[PDB]
Amino acid sequence: GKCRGLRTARKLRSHRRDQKWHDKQYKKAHLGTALKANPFGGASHAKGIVLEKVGVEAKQPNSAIRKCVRVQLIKNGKKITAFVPNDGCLNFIEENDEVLVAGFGRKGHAVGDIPGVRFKVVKVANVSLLALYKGKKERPR
Template structure:
């Protein structure tokens, strides 16, 4: 029976199989993100899990449809590279603990660099406030 399509199945086809697998891996989104290095350059944290920043202003971001709310966020300038990001302030009334020019610790929001829920464009959250 002749193998017209598909992978080689011969006893000495190991190198060919390995090379094909290596080429096809680039179609995998996660592999490409990890190995190209462009995602790391675009990441404001530069590969770190947390980052410190200075609060520039408090902002209210409108929730996406069908929800109607103003999500309390802060505009933060990171200390390590000067990039400005928006960070969500979680829990009820916690925006009252944050003032402008405070130093805050920022972490990711939990979806590997994507915005969460109904808050558009916000990929980070405040985890600690130090005056």
């Protein structure tokens, strides 16, 4: 602190109050703009409907094709490219399927090789994509 007056409580509090806005992690949480522009509307997960299956070219170094899924969210009507996890799990996603969709892990930031894809597909037609991959549940059709 740069005012050690005994009667300086408000300058020290009112400075700190003003300088907390220059923090990212604070400015984000304490404005509507981060919580509005969030496609999930501040929710953890979100059910949406697959409208196409999309190949996304991996980043500069490594070079695969990352199989993601273009999603119309129910609650918002908003557009999302959400990644599909492990080997050969895009074979489990028929078009126009209700998929439960979570974040990727970095609180709405793009992960690894996948440019501007912040989401993974968790369940497809209310059946878990780990259970389909392990073959425990069979896809109800």
